[PDB]
């Protein structure tokens, strides 16, 4: 929800999300929904953002409507911030348990130490049931199973109410006598030493001694009960296993890219060279959460969000199968109402008119190749 | 004019209640704004209530208001509850926002977004002031007590949230699991300024050393804010802004 | 008569109005309030800003204007009894100012200590701001000035020279609103996170300290209260 | 000039130094960029320069070589991840308007001290 | 490197995306001068008035 | 007679001398001025430093010395008319000091805002410095002191106790020269670039603020001007 | 490996071995971009002749 407002060029050149999949679209209370996919860190990292030396895999949602059961970068759990390498590709998996009924827009975002939140594509997920049915059971190493929805709540309330009560009593004690004007006049007109006389001093000493004794005894009691405690677990996790993607056999060179101002289309000229030994064809172009597809080549079956999916938004002047070894130059136009709905044409207001994206080339056998393109994006007005 | 002595007393009483209300809510508003913008982050999250950063910075930035309000109230009325009223107002505002907003607007659990207890420190600060009139003594001793009693005062509450748990192969505390679960979209895990451990952390002295460091810093903050409150208690007239 | 039932209304309006404000934002947080570029956001949150900014400016002019227009010209010839009444009315004004201060500088601001901790900043005019920065802050700023103007135009001894403490307690807290430029510039620029203890925030802290001049204001008000009808009773 | 004029007018008009510091400072901060817009406007026309998008001012800086002033030293807007829509110029203007209030407030007393007329009789 | 000729012969033509060719040696110079002279004039008048 | 034609010369010398200074550096910037290790640089820029440093020290001693030698011993017995003349002469001295201040703290310093923005710092004694730091700064420092000494030795009421504002307006700006050690140490050490807004520079800024004591100096001079021949006319 | 266990005054003892920098460097410590090979001993009981 938090995107569309960020700079279009930085949204284009930060983290490319692809192969996204959602296990369920409608879930009940306490049911689990799993979000999978891959994200690639762009080599041309914007200089304005710090490198993802310290990154956290977060989830974009309106409050705690879904509790993050588990989250994985690669294949290992990542409850803390992790280190990501620029240019590497990682696969992620987030498990969410439904907590609050309603329709929510879930995004698979990434938080960089000093570069803002990098929100990915968002999918509407419907939650049905009642919030009172939500349970968050967790077994401790002490051998006890407690719910995280109301654990320590009673104890937390008691202690706070207990102290607030003590404070009120203290103020109340002195609040019985007249407070402001006679005491001010007494302190002013002549010496004071009458508004504070024993047994007032005795009461204050009792209050101080009782406070100290209660604090010490409460600490001792909280040390007997729950005798095993550990400090808060924190620290950036290094050694994030990246995906071992095979070197692309298709080389693409971007020779100028233009978009109409105003307009809903982006045009670029690409010189595609097909290496290896298989007829390939451009079937998709992902720039910033928006997928421009050529319906004659590739069709989306993973339930991608409708507002971010262009079924026939990718038009190629010559999309005939490219024979191996053959190199040709074509004109590629990506046009969809989503280029204006997500303010993708607001890159002219940005201080860096450069774009980055992913091109997906598919062969006759159906296997696909992922290549990355980045070039200056030149607005056209006349 | 006033009429008689009886009316005077009543009128004085009425004024007292009204004046108290004005002082309490103006302090709550200012104190809260000051408290939440200097230590709010730690006071928001149980997985933020650590042993180094929270215990260090909370008393240091929380003794400011109590020092000034004591320096005014005690000096002008011999009323030794400035620190207590400041702490109670901050706690009331925080709890109101914790229940109606954090658990009202959004749905964050109370045991996850509970505030920290500061009553014991306020009490010590007031007692050591009434008991031992000297502002110097209170700044050196009551500030020591305020800094030192913070973590032990909150230990009964956060203790239960520190039980170790085997969570998907990784060791996490209850507060850590709470923070991991209830997603904070605007608050990523790396933003958490908590104890991470250094190479110069000998044995078990994180909580006591931080407590002692906060106790010392609070001395200086109380000393400065006593004069700040004196200046704020001035009664001059300008006649042209 | 003295202290009337004007204080009851004073506490009521703020509570009532602010109670409905929470209900509004509570019903319009998520959906046509989350996305800042949606057409429904301009109808539920953009309109609120506009409407509230006009009413605030209008009311301020009227309130302050009317208060300054009916200012007592013959303060010298004011009976002690009457003065007492005016002092009680000014105390009611101070109570209303304290209530508005709490609502704007404690609730909605910490009510915000939550929204961000849950959603990503969509724009500089998010729901909570359309409530905190541009509604509650102007409301208390209006009340503050009103209280100050009333004291300097009605009650004797609070006039003939602007009270330093009173001026600092009315302008100090009033400076927070403009500092909104700071934290915005903080967010938009220096700082890409959501830390609540960041510097682009000490601006509210610095001018939140100036609200401590309420102590000098209240002792000055006490002295004014204890002018003619200060006794006796007091020290007698 | 426009800022100076506003600062003076709001001072003569409305004698109170407090008012001038809060209002005239607001005006001084806010009118800076609009006052300079007629001049720098023409230097902001987009140009296709060797495949890269550059403004006229950018091309001027690229051309006329500053040996001691490399491109990276330029403290200019580079865009962050928390830059919502079109609010760079207004927010910066408002931030400067607020900061100028404080600077005016401090420098009023600085000028008062500099306007003192004391005598020492021994340095 | 030796340069021969006159500085007055130097030209720095540049075509904008708006469809106009302007020289970078004197572009906006006139406009820059006008506005500055205009404001300086206003300031002088203000000071002159009280002067 | 009163205000004579000494003011004309005062404005002339600085302008003329500084006009030729620009011509010199203008003709000796590039070629035997760029390379700081060339033999021609020691003949055109190294010699300048030496020569100007000797003349400055010599002139200062003479000027200040002569001014302090002919100091009026019998200030008490000074006719109002004569005092007025001396006040006008001190005003001419202040005009010369203001002219030198502008030349040294505005022109040559911003004249420098350019040289660096074009060439790489070859040494601590580059052409612009052989003009700004070691010529114009000592010249205005000399004029400043001279003006101060003259006022304390001639005109009545400006003596018998060093004027704070005058001392701050003569020493404040005089401290910039020594701070040259700072920015040099800045350049040579902390900071490898050419940023003009770097800290190793606020040293000139801090002591450039002390030139604002000219306001106190001028009101003090006004009071001195309005001693005997203050009227009337004035308030009459 | 240690060349000697007991040495006389002015005699030389050589300490050899290998050290491996762990890939999972704790985030609390800065990376060894600037590292110094020191020797842990109570004062100058041994003078560092050479270090490689
Ligand atoms: C009646 C009056 C007599 C009482 C005197 C008190 C005796 C001292 C007890 C030592 C605690 C202990 O035992 O060790 C210290 C424990 C460490 O714990 P550990 O990891 O087990 O260390 C085991 C190592 N040993 C076995 C050698 C102890 O925490 C601390 O480092 C506390 C650090 C606080 C430093 C800041 C102090 C500043 C003082 C300010 C002055 C006002
Ligand atoms: C007027 C002043 C009143 C002060 C009252 C103090 C109450 C005593 C608390 C016991 C501390 C403790 O038990 O050990 C230290 C613990 C830290 O433990 P942890 O690292 O969280 O370990 C977790 C496992 N637990 C649960 C077993 C701890 O708490 C603190 O860090 C606060 C240290 C402050 C104590 C300073 C007292 C020294 C005397 C003051 C001298 C001038
Ligand atoms: C001292 C200076 C104070 C001045 C500040 C006043 C700011 C006004 C707020 C603007 C409202 C807005 O934002 O818009 C106005 C909204 C637009 O919302 P809608 O989508 O049409 O929903 C329909 C509106 N309901 C959902 C509220 C019905 O409708 C309204 O008019 C009705 C709002 C009336 C609120 C008054 C109730 C208060 C209770 C009694 C206390 C007086
Ligand atoms: C007369 C005294 C008045 C001086 C005040 C003027 C405002 C200073 C403007 C700084 C611009 C600059 O100097 O540089 C700008 C630097 C360049 O950093 P970057 O490489 O873009 O870092 C990238 C990191 N981002 C992406 C987050 C930006 O950004 C900064 O670090 C901003 C530092 C904050 C300075 C403002 C503090 C204001 C204090 C408010 C407390 C009440
Ligand atoms: C007669 C009196 C009534 C006038 C009331 C004025 C109405 C408000 C107009 C809003 C401007 C606008 O329209 O949006 C704001 C434009 C953004 O532009 P955008 O990218 O198109 O955002 C489109 C998103 N929308 C469609 C939701 C708007 O710039 C700004 O963020 C300005 C940021 C300034 C923040 C600092 C303010 C500090 C105030 C200090 C107090 C003295
Ligand atoms: C006494 C006070 C007098 C103030 C006079 C203000 C003149 C109005 C200028 C219009 C601004 C504009 O048009 O939009 C904002 C533009 C920024 O645009 P940009 O990002 O460069 O876009 C480039 C494309 N252009 C050329 C179309 C812009 O300028 C500014 O950032 C200055 C914003 C300050 C305006 C604040 C006024 C709010 C009222 C003040 C309330 C207390
Ligand atoms: C209040 C204290 C002020 C004292 C400061 C005075 C510093 C003197 C500057 C040193 C000059 C230098 O740098 O060297 C001296 C240069 C060496 O240069 P050259 O290569 O031989 O070129 C030949 C010199 N021409 C190119 C200038 C001819 O020759 C000279 O003698 C001649 C310089 C005379 C300058 C005086 C003209 C001023 C116009 C009338 C105003 C009085
Ligand atoms: C009683 C109070 C007086 C204190 C003043 C003493 C001077 C301080 C000397 C610093 C040496 C140090 O501490 O360290 C030296 C550090 C080490 O950095 P590096 O690793 O070499 O960085 C390499 C980067 N280079 C290559 C650019 C150096 O260089 C610094 O960052 C210098 C910081 C500037 C400090 C001086 C500020 C002076 C303020 C002037 C405003 C009027
Ligand atoms: C040299 C430094 C060592 C510490 C002493 C610092 C205290 C100085 C405070 C001061 O200036 O004096 C204020 C009061 C005066 O009350 P007195 O009328 O002197 O009461 C004397 C009887 N008494 C022992 C019960 C107090 O006297 C007191 O403040 C209380 C005196 C009793 C000491 C314990 C009080 C503090 C409790 C924590
Ligand atoms: C953030 C820092 C906290 C702010 C506290 C600073 C207060 C400084 C004191 C001050 O304002 O001095 C007022 C004088 C004007 O004097 P006068 O109006 O002549 O009043 C006569 C009596 N008096 C000289 C003692 C004031 O100087 C003036 O020129 C009038 C300016 C008054 C502005 C004070 C209002 C501060 C609100 C923020
Ligand atoms: C409560 C805060 C709301 C804003 C009010 C702050 C202004 C206070 C300034 C002040 O202390 O008074 C100085 C002058 C006194 O002149 P007066 O002789 O009162 O003139 C009254 C007639 N007039 C309305 C045309 C001004 O009066 C003025 O300063 C001018 C008053 C007219 C207001 C508009 C002037 C500012 C223009 C930008
Ligand atoms: C960068 C900071 C700005 C500088 C402003 C600081 C000025 C401090 C005021 C000051 O200098 O006090 C002078 C006293 C000596 O007093 P006396 O020479 O006895 O003069 C009697 C009258 N008086 C005491 C009021 C001065 O104290 C002394 O011992 C004489 C020292 C005078 C030095 C002031 C010259 C400042 C030039 C930079
Ligand atoms: C001293 C500050 C009191 C703040 C109480 C508050 O925010 O109330 C809103 C909250 C809203 O929760 P709830 O009562 O369940 O009603 C929900 C209605 N909305 C969602 C519009 C707030 O609860 C109430 O309305 C209780 C009434 C208290 C009167 C002092
Ligand atoms: C009264 C204490 C003020 C201390 C200031 C501070 O904590 O700043 C932290 C920040 C360090 O930046 P960092 O915390 O690393 O910010 C990370 C997020 N980004 C990179 C987006 C800013 O330093 C600065 O940029 C200079 C602050 C000047 C204060 C007048
Ligand atoms: C109020 C400060 C005036 C500064 C003027 C200046 O720097 O003049 C040098 C510059 C040099 O350019 P130009 O006149 O073409 O003569 C070149 C001679 N050199 C290269 C030696 C400067 O132009 C003049 O000499 C004009 C005379 C103005 C008299 C107030
Ligand atoms: C009144 C504001 C002063 C702020 C100081 C400042 O901007 O310093 C920037 C600098 C950061 O260095 P940076 O700008 O990265 O310098 C880049 C060029 N080198 C590395 C050669 C210095 O920080 C320091 O070294 C400490 C300054 C202490 C001031 C009393
Ligand atoms: C940093 C604390 C300074 C407080 C200023 C108090 C000044 C009082 C003058 C009457
Ligand atoms: C930071 C501004 C402080 C200015 C000092 C003024 C002191 C005046 C004393 C007469
Ligand atoms: Cl805020
Ligand atoms: Cl310089
Ligand atoms: Cu969304
Ligand atoms: Cu990528
Ligand atoms: Cu907000
Ligand atoms: Cu230089
Ligand atoms: Cu290893």
Curated annotation (Swiss-Prot), chain B:
InterPro entries: NH3/CH4_mOase_suA_sf (IPR037001), NH3_CH4_mOase_A (IPR003393). GO terms for cellular component: membrane. It comes from the Bacteria. It is a multi-pass membrane protein. It is an enzyme of class 1 (oxidoreductase). The keyword Cytoplasm does not apply. Keywords: Membrane, Monooxygenase, Oxidoreductase, Transmembrane, Transmembrane helix. The chain crosses the membrane at residues 17-37, 53-73, 80-100, 105-125, 139-159, 209-229. This is Particulate methane monooxygenase beta subunit.
From Swiss-Prot, chain D:
It comes from the Bacteria. M.capsulatus has two forms of methane monooxygenase, a soluble (sMMO) and a membrane-bound (particulate) type (pMMO). The particulate type is a nonamer composed of three alpha:beta:gamma heterotrimeric protomers assembled into a cylindrical structure; the beta and gamma subunits comprise the bulk of the membrane-spanning regions and the soluble regions are derived primarily from alpha subunits which form two antiparallel beta-barrel-like structures each. The chain holds residues 125 to 247 of 247 of the full protein. Non-catalytic subunit of the methane monooxygenase that is responsible for the initial oxygenation of methane to methanol in methanotrophs. At least in vitro, specific quinols can replace NADH as reductants. It is found in: Membrane. The lineage of its organism: Bacteria, Pseudomonadati, Pseudomonadota, Gammaproteobacteria, Methylococcales. Products of both gene copies, pmoA1 and pmoA2, are required for full cellular activity. The gene is pmoA1. This is Particulate methane monooxygenase beta subunit. The chain crosses the membrane at residues 21-41, 91-111.
From Swiss-Prot, chain E:
The chain crosses the membrane at residues 30-50. It comes from the Bacteria. It is found in: Membrane. Methane monooxygenase is responsible for the initial oxygenation of methane to methanol in methanotrophs. At least in vitro, specific quinols can replace NADH as reductants. M.capsulatus has two forms of methane monooxygenase, a soluble (sMMO) and a membrane-bound (particulate) type (pMMO). The particulate type is a nonamer composed of three alpha:beta:gamma heterotrimeric protomers assembled into a cylindrical structure; the beta and gamma subunits comprise the bulk of the membrane-spanning regions and the soluble regions are derived primarily from alpha subunits which form two antiparallel beta-barrel-like structures each. This is Particulate methane monooxygenase alpha subunit.
């Amino acid at each position: 929800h938090g995107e569309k407002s960020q700079a279009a060029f930085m949204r284009m050149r930060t983290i490319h999300w692809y192969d996204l999949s959602w296990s369920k679209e409608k879930v009940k209370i306490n049911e689990t929904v799993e979000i999978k996919g891959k994200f690639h860190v762009f080599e041309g990292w914007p200089e304005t953002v710090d490198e993802p030396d310290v990154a956290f895999l977060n989830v974009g949602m309106p409050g705690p409507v879904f509790i993050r059961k588990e989250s994985y970068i690669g294949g290992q759990l990542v409850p803390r911030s992790v280190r990501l390498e620029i240019g590497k590709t990682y696969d992620f998996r987030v498990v969410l348990k439904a907590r609050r009924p309603g329709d929510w827009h879930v995004h698979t975002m990434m938080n960089v130490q000093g570069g803002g939140p990098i929100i990915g594509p968002g999918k509407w997920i419907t939650v049905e049931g009642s919030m009172s049915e939500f349970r968050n059971p967790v077994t401790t190493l002490t051998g006890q199973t407690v719910d995280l929805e109301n654990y320590n709540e009673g104890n937390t309330y008691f202690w706070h109410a207990f102290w607030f009560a003590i404070g009120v009593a203290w103020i109340g004690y002195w609040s019985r006598r007249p407070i402001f004007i006679p005491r001010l006049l007494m302190v002013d007109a002549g010496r004071a030493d009458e508004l504070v006389s024993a047994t007032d001093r005795k009461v204050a000493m009792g209050f101080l001694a009782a406070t100290i004794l209660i604090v010490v005894m409460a600490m001792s009691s909280a040390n007997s009960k729950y005798p095993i405690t550990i400090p808060l677990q924190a620290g950036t996790m290094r050694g994030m296993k990246p995906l071992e993607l095979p070197a692309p056999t298709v080389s693409v060179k971007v020779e100028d890219a233009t978009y109409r101002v105003p307009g809903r289309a982006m045009r670029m000229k690409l010189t595609i060279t097909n290496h290896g030994n298989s007829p390939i064809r451009l079937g998709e172009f992902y720039t910033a959460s928006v997928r421009f597809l050529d319906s004659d080549v590739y069709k989306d079956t993973t339930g991608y969000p409708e507002d971010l999916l262009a079924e026939d938004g990718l038009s190629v002047s010559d999309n005939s199968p490219l024979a191996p070894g053959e190199t040709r130059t074509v004109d590629v136009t990506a046009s969809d109402a989503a280029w204006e709905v997500y303010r993708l044409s607001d890159i002219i207001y940005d201080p860096d008119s450069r774009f980055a994206g992913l091109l997906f080339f598919f062969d006759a056998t159906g296997n696909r190749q992922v290549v990355q393109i980045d070039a200056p994006l030149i607005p056209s007005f006349m | 004019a006033v009429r008689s002595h009886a009316e005077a007393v009543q009128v004085s009483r009425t004024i007292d209640w009204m004046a108290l209300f004005v002082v309490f809510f103006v302090i709550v508003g200012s104190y809260h704004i000051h408290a939440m913008l200097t230590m709010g982050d730690w006071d928001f999250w149980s997985d933020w209530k650590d042993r180094r950063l929270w215990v260090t910075v909370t008393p240091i930035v929380l003794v400011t208001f109590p020092a000034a309000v004591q320096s005014y109230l005690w000096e002008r009325y011999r009323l030794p509850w400035g620190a207590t009223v400041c702490v109670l107002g901050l706690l009331l505002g925080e709890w109101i926002n914790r229940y109606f907003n954090f658990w009202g607007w959004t749905y964050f659990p109370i045991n996850f977004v509970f505030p920290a207890s500061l009553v014991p420190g306020a009490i010590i600060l007031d007692t050591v002031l009434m008991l031992s009139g000297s502002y110097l003594f209170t700044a050196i001793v009551g500030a020591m007590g305020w800094g030192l009693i913070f973590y032990p005062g909150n230990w009964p509450i956060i203790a239960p949230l520190h039980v170790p748990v085997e969570y998907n192969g990784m060791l996490m505390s209850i507060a850590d699991i709470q923070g991991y679960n209830y997603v904070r979209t605007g608050t990523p895990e790396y933003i958490r300024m908590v104890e991470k451990g250094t190479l110069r952390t000998f044995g078990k002295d994180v909580a006591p050393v931080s407590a002692f460091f906060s106790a010392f810093m609070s001395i200086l903050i109380y000393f400065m804010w006593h004069f700040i409150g004196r200046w704020f208690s001035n009664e001059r007239f300008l006649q042209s802004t | 008569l003295l202290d009337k039932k004007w204080l009851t209304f004073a506490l009521a309006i703020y509570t009532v109005f602010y109670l409905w404000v929470r209900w509004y934002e509570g019903v319009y947080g998520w959906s046509a309030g989350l996305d800042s570029f949606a057409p429904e956001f301009e109808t539920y949150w953009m309109n609120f800003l506009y409407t509230e900014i006009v009413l605030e400016i209008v009311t301020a002019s009227i309130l302050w204007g009317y208060l300054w227009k009916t200012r007592d010209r013959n303060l010298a010839a004011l009976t002690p009894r009457e003065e007492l009444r005016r002092n009680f009315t000014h105390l009611v004004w101070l109570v209303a100012y304290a209530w508005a201060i709490y609502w704007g500088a404690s609730y909605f601001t910490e009510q915000d200590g939550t929204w961000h901790q849950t959603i990503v900043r969509d724009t500089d005019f998010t729901p909570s701001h359309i409530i905190e920065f541009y509604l509650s802050y102007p409301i208390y700023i209006i009340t503050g000035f009103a209280a100050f103007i009333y004291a300097k135009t009605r009650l004797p001894f609070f006039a003939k020279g602007i009270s330093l403490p009173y001026l600092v307690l009315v302008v100090g807290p009033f400076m927070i609103l403009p500092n909104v430029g700071l934290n915005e510039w903080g967010h938009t620029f220096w700082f890409m996170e959501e830390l609540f203890v960041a510097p682009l925030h000490y601006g509210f802290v610095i001018f939140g300290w100036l609200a401590l001049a309420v102590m000098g204001t209240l002792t000055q008000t006490f002295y004014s209260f204890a002018q003619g009808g200060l006794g006796q009773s007091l020290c007698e």
